[PDB]
């Protein structure tokens, strides 16, 4: 099993590496804002769904709405037109679904937050999710594609200071 | 939960 840790700026894969990572919209990248919609993800434990399921489902093409999915999916950037060129640039190219993995995490913030993912946009913000350095997904593929057995990934989110929850993921 |  892999227990990733996320402290607001760094996503650590123990024994492998540290990845730049960011959570929350630009003014909401603070541990004390974690119960505000689209802010830094609430602290606690989350399961990652790393099973690779290909293209994410499109719930409404006109409104650029992607449907939820419980796995690792890709963002259909190649067909984006008009406003969806803007909106899907905030997803990136890859997303991994997160689910709260204990009751305390699930009940955080009156239970009013959800729909969490790890994704590889390069904006320096995330709409209530975790934006990670794109190389994370290449390490993930390399470390898992040769393994035959169970592949269990979680992430613990714990902010140990008031520092901004921005790890420098905006494209250089 | 949407993400626009």
Numbering used by the authors:
A (entry chain A): 3 to 174
B (entry chain C): 301 to 304
Please give me the paper's original passages concerning this structure.
One such T6SS effector is Tlde1a from Salmonella Typhimurium. Tlde1a functions as an LD-carboxypeptidase to cleave tetrapeptide stems and as an LD-transpeptidase to exchange the terminal D-alanine of a tetrapeptide stem with a noncanonical D-amino acid. Our structural data revealed that Tlde1a possesses a unique LD-transpeptidase fold consisting of a dual pocket active site with a capping subdomain. This includes an exchange pocket to bind a D-amino acid for exchange and a catalytic pocket to position the D-alanine of a tetrapeptide stem for cleavage.
To probe the molecular details of Tlde1a, purified Tlde1a from S. Typhimurium was crystallized and its structure determined using X-ray crystallography. Tlde1a crystallized as a monomer in the space group P41212 and the structure was modeled to a resolution of 1.65 Å. Initial phases were obtained by single anomalous diffraction on a home source diffractometer using Tlde1a crystals soaked with sodium iodide. Due to the presence of β-mercaptoethanol (β-ME) in the buffer conditions, the active site residue C131 was modified to S,S-(2-hydroxymethyl)thiocysteine (CME). Tlde1a adopts a primarily β-sheet fold (blue) with the core of the domain comprised of a β-sandwich (β1-4 and β9-12) that is bounded on either side by α-helices (α2 and α3) (gold). Additionally, the Tlde1a structure is stabilized by two conserved disulfide linkages highlighted in magenta (C66-C86 and C37-C111). Moreover, in the Tlde1a native structure, the D-amino acid binding pocket is occupied by a sulfate from the crystallization condition, supporting the observation that H-bonds are the primary mode of ligand binding. All three Tlde1a crystal structures included the His-tag of a symmetry mate bound in the Tlde1a active site as a crystal packing artifact. In all three structures, the His-tag occupies the highly conserved active site and makes van der Waals packing contacts with the Tlde1a capping subdomain (β6-7, helix α1, and 310 helix (η2)). However, most of the peptide backbone interactions of the His-tag with Tlde1a are mediated by ordered water molecules or sulfates from the crystallization condition.
